[PDB]
Swiss-Prot record, chain A:
Biological process annotations from GO: actin cytoskeleton organization; cardiac muscle cell proliferation; cytokine-mediated signaling pathway; epithelial tube branching involved in lung morphogenesis; female pregnancy; forebrain astrocyte development; gene expression; glial cell proliferation
Modified residues (N6-acetyllysine): 103
Predominant place of localization: membrane
Post-translational modification: Acetylation at Lys-103 prevents interaction with guanine nucleotide exchange factors (GEFs).
CDD domains in UniProt: H_N_K_Ras_like (cd04138)
Gene: KRAS
Mode of membrane association: Lipid-anchor
Reported effect, residue 39 to A: Decreased interaction with MAPKAP1/SIN1
Localization: Cell membrane; Endomembrane system; Cytoplasm, Cytosol
Catalysed transformations (reactions): GTP + H2O = GDP + phosphate + H(+)
Name of the protein: GTPase KRas
EC identifiers of the protein: 3.6.5.2
Organism: Homo sapiens (Human)
Effect ascribed to mutating residue 37 to A: Decreased interaction with MAPKAP1/SIN1
Keyword match Ligase: no
């Protein structure tokens, strides 16, 4: 059983750092922001094995038919913001709207991810994120790509959501 | 000719005040933020008469398939920001991208409108908006719905843009 996971979020929230931690078990500082690539990983979650095809999104603020079609192939999405970046949290609503748009307003598997939780420079309250995740009906996971806090949990939780949805 | 004009922009930038000034020649200190309505007006621009149907957009930050097809009926778009609201200027990119998406075109008739020019507490430099409009290939008009400065010119300029695009 193979699932296409897509990691989305504003520039600089930690999409690549989170993915590379998951796949390669190290923290990359300031990874090339133009590289969009897909990673493969076999996992066991709740005793059951799944193969993940994980798209680490990168590119410009723009839309197109082919990008719509490509994102439509995603089966679950990590909505990543950074806890020290209010704009990236406000953007989450836009990411969800565009994902639902291209997937016919399906109840798409999604996990809200609050990254950079190691930092003391918080601007988004945990309560705000929990309330937002509650409104959307999705889990919220606090992560740090730097310390690896929550990294496996974020991706594993998204797989749990895909399984529930299937 | 009959042209559908659509007024877009962030909450509070003056979309309704601009439209009501154009149509009814007065300034509203406050107007219900949920009312989205269309207004008609016959005008003569550059010696030629046109019938304008002006959609004053209001509502929530959400997409719907019917919303896409409604916006698709627009033939030209006013991108309104407020010159004392940096965030409303930063949002202009998003509005333009959504218009291009539903029109499936990069050459949609548009005018960039910097409203509330009467205020002294500017936070968006005029050159920054001029440079943005240049990169978009569209006109930039400074307006005040309060004093009526630029109001006719914003809508008339959009009609000129539509005319240039249809021919
Ligand atoms: C930093 C400036 N470079 C910045 O904030 N962003 C934000 C958006 N970014 C982004 N990169 C790659 N891919 C996408 C993307 F596919 C979409 C998207 C979605 C989620 C659904 C449907 C879409 N149709 N076209 C694009 C679509 C979005 Cl919203 C943003 C993407 C990084 C740059
Ligand atoms: C208020 C709270 N901060 C606020 O800023 N907004 C943002 C703008 N909003 C809005 N209201 C009504 N209609 C739209 C709208 F049609 C679109 C839009 C555009 C510009 C192009 C294509 C579209 N397809 N579906 C919707 C489309 C946008 Cl982007 C915003 C709209 C709500 C309140
Ligand atoms: N302190 C801290 N920095 C992070 C974290 N995740 C990513 N970064 C850093 O934030 C910046 C942006 O990360 P990046 O992975 O490139 O974000 P992306 O643009 O969403 O792919 C980099 O300098 C990263 O080193 C984190 O969890 N904690
Ligand atoms: N000083 C000043 N205030 C304006 C102007 N245009 C709109 N407003 C005010 O800004 C607020 C929002 O106007 P409104 O038309 O309701 O914004 P909308 O949400 O974009 O439709 C109102 O209090 C208006 O009176 C302007 O040109 N100058
Ligand atoms: Ca990246
Ligand atoms: Ca749910
Ligand atoms: Ca027409
Ligand atoms: Ca209004
Ligand atoms: Ca909806
Ligand atoms: Ca042009």
């Amino acid at each position: 059983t193979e699932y296409k996971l897509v990691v989305v979020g504003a520039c600089g929230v930690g999409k690549s750092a989170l993915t590379i931690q998951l796949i390669q078990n190290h923290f990359v500082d300031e990874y090339d922001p133009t590289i969009e690539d897909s990673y493969r990983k076999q996992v066991v979650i709740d005793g059951e094995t799944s193969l993940l095809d994980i798209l680490d999104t990168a590119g410009q603020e723009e839309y197109s038919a082919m990008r719509d079609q490509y994102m439509r192939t995603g089966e679950g999405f990590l909505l990543v913001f950074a806890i020290n970046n209010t704009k990236s949290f406000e953007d989450i609503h836009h990411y969800r709207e565009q994902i639902k748009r291209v997937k016919d307003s399906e109840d798409v598997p999604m996990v809200l991810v609050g990254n950079k939780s190691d930092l003391p420079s918080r601007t988004v309250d945990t309560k705000q994120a929990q309330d937002l995740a509650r409104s959307y009906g999705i889990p919220f996971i606090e992560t740090s790509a730097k310390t690896r806090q929550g990294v496996d949990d974020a991706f594993y939780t998204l797989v749990r959501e895909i399984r529930k949805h299937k």
